[model samples]
Target: EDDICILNHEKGSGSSRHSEKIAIRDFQVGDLVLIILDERHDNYVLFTVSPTLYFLHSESLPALDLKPRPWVLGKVMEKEYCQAKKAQNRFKVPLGTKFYRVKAVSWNKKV
Candidate 1:
């Protein structure tokens, strides 16, 4: 984790909205999130929206109060990894990752 840089924010001008959907057990910012985006963006990290969405590591996060929240370890629905310059329209991530039956955490281990 100390050697890696995880991104919890969206990769687009509308980072404001991407920040809203990226689930954070407690809604955190500047943190690495591994969740699905109902919307779209302009960049790509590693995990896809159709495969399994796993958290990078515990070191990549700050600290939580250990509260109860809707956790989810769903799979990737659509990880197109597209990037344009329109600035208005982004990408779309739909279907595939909708296996949210049980809430789970994004960070699985401390890499």
Candidate 2:
């Protein structure tokens, strides 16, 4: 019942395609998102989000060839959740740590 996108990223080969349902509001411009191919061949991708914008996996850094790195997979961003310190490890940062701004991309509001 909200704005969401169905994104598809194919693997080496196969017909069992996996797609992600990213919410339009979850993306922030300039954030370097990481992606990885599943060894089990599950038709899906693995990822996560964090507050204060932390570091990404060293291995995942390379081969960053996805169109939507920091893509949103949810239907709603929830205004209350935006900029809130609700993410896991949100409180792990040291004092004076600066949090990055979330610049979400615009999508059709047909929901």
Candidate 3:
């Protein structure tokens, strides 16, 4: 299965008790992702990771082309908002947004 269970947000004592594990599909459309950066001081960007099968609008970067590895740290976005944004801009390569196949893993809350 591509789906994995992860915490909704950062974990805390009481917060952990209240929050539950949210199942997120790997590299699903409209998921929040951080494209790895090589610079020592810099590490990631607030990009959205979506599948390469469909035409996508808005600004985007390919997760697979990243150096060191072809993977990204990802997390779930707000359900309705993500859907709305994706649907509104559901329409690219150089002048258009780049799309690439890549692997995705859950992001660490502590980081």
Candidate 4:
């Protein structure tokens, strides 16, 4: 049976913004990152080592259940470093250090 999955945007009713930016230096090559796509959180793997430009895998491969898809190129446009809040430790991220966010754009393979 196909189960219904509630989308991230549909799960909330508030107008508060959820997207945040992070510094380019915060991420290293091959780091699994979370990205915003169509108002939903998508998983991407970072592959760029440049300080000015950021690149990630277009397909959301972290789920592992989805079918294999061609890799598309993604670029970072804007960048966040924020402290973790109480009860947020479950995410498994560093508690004392800050977390980074970034705005990215993806393009087709033709580019």
**How well is each residue in 32-66 modelled by candidate 2, as lDDT tens digits?**
33333333422123244533242222322222333
Better of 2 and 4 by lDDT: 4
Clashing pairs in 4: 21-79, 21-80, 21-101, 22-79, 22-80, 22-101, 22-102, 23-80, 80-101
Model 4 stretches astray by more than 4 angstroms? 1-45, 48-72, 87-91, 108-111
Candidate 4, overall lDDT?
Answer: 0.39
The residue-by-residue lDDT of candidate 4 on 1-111, one tens digit each, is 369775665555765765433323556433233332221123333433443323233333333222323333444444444455764453234446454444445433222
The segments of candidate 2 whose C-alpha lies over 4 angstroms from its true place after superposition are 1-13, 16-18, 21-95, 108-111
Better of 3 and 4 by TM-score: 4
The lDDT leader among the candidates is 4
Which residue pairs collide, candidate 3?
none
Clashes of each: 8, 6, 0, 9
Among all windows of 10 consecutive residues in model 2, the one with the lowest summed lDDT is: 73-82
Residue 2 alpha-carbon offset, candidate 4, angstroms? 55
Q: Each prediction's Cα lDDT score?
A: 0.31, 0.33, 0.36, 0.39
TM-score of 2: 0.22
* Local accuracy of candidate 1 as per-residue lDDT tens digits, 3-110: 978867556454333322344342233333443323233222223444433322222222221221223333223222223334343232343332221222344433
